[PDB]
């Protein structure tokens, strides 16, 4: 009578409680600084905020009953403590017997595990509160949040293939937009690193939050480029040219991505480099072949930021913003090229 989603959830959390297990309590008490009260405080605060926003209605979302909210919270708290256990049991420090006070006092990790847990609970019930509702309600930076998604996938083999697909999916929403927000902390991370964007070779072939974000951004872009390149029948050595233009846009004109979508910068490069090449392709061909990809939706080429505000079209954005800042680079290929991952 329950959906495959809700049934998997129900069977993941069976026999488990909204509290730390005695195995976790022992790991907490092993640490110099016991994290249990900080962890319970974060959960109570996230708990109150989730049910306050769930209960009250907004134009966007009508508010639902507290009784459904409390159940959704209890299931997410049960997921939280079970997943925290598997993560902590399996950290190399635990396995070498070394104190885990530093790991367990990172507030950002606990808040973003609780929020993914809530996203799992809400997706499984096909909640109308589509991501990123939960991270906006909880004041969680995509740039910091997206890193727990990979851990959760690794730390709970009970998750359905559909759930891992949803979690990979929202990971890809953050890497294509969301983390390129004017208010995102990737801009602060870039500033503390002299505004030096990592290159594909420096991450794919240093280490830190900016590097593994770019790591992840590059490999999403890599996968998406091969797919437009195969659907458009274009070359495989031109492919390395538009990647080098894409890397140039990310490294030397990072601002172009502010309040924008990575696809917008990926397709604009494809047209430029192809037109600079004999391998000319045009936007309708590019847009129709992209229209097939799963994240491709109307808004990404019929609504593009121009000034911050006015919004237009992919071609208006290409000509008004993209060709001035990228034409000088593209003309060189009518030179060094960047290594394409895999």
């Amino acid at each position: 009578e329950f959906t495959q989603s809700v049934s998997r959830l129900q069977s993941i959390v069976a026999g488990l409680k909204n509290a730390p297990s005695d195995q976790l309590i022992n790991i907490f008490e092993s640490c110099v600084r016991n994290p249990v009260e900080n962890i319970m405080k974060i959960l109570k605060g996230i708990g109150e905020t989730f049910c306050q926003h769930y209960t009250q209605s907004t134009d966007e979302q009508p508010g639902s009953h507290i009784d459904f909210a409390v159940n959704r919270l209890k299931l997410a708290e049960i997921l939280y403590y079970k997943i925290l256990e598997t993560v902590m049991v399996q950290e190399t420090r635990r396995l070498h017997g070394m104190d885990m006070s530093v790991l367990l006092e990172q507030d950002i990790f606990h808040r973003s595990l609780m929020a993914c847990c809530l996203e799992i609970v809400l997706f499984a019930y096909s909640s109308p509160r589509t991501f990123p509702w939960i991270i906006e309600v909880l004041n969680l930076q995509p740039f910091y949040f997206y890193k727990v998604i990979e851990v959760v996938i690794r730390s709970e083999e009970g998750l359905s293939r559909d759930m891992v697909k949803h979690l990979n999916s929202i990971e890809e929403q953050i890497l294509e937009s969301l983390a390129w927000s004017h208010d995102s902390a990737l801009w602060e991370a870039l500033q503390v690193s002299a505004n030096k964007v990592p290159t594909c070779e420096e991450v794919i072939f240093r280490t830190g939050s900016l590097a593994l974000f770019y790591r992840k951004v590059y490999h999403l872009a890599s996968v998406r480029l091969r797919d437009l390149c195969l659907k458009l029948d274009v070359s495989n050595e031109l492919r390395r040219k538009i990647w080098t233009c894409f890397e140039f846009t990310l490294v030397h004109c990072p601002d172009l991505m502010k309040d924008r979508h990575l696809d917008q910068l990926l397709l604009c490069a494809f047209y430029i480099m192809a037109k600079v090449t004999k391998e000319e392709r045009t936007f309708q061909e590019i847009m129709k072949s992209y229209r097939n990809q799963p994240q491709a939706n109307s808004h990404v080429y019929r609504s593009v930021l121009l000034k911050s505000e006015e919004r237009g079209d992919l071609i208006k954005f290409y000509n008004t913003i993209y060709v001035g800042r990228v034409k000088s680079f593209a003309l060189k290929y009518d030179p060094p090229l960047s290594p394409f991952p895999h």
């Binding site: 936007f283 309708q284 847009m287 071609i315």
Partner: peptide, 10 residues
């Protein structure tokens, strides 16, 4: 110049 005069479908 590098550019396009192509419109798009609705």
């Amino acid at each position: 110049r590098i550019a396009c005069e192509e419109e798009f479908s609705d």
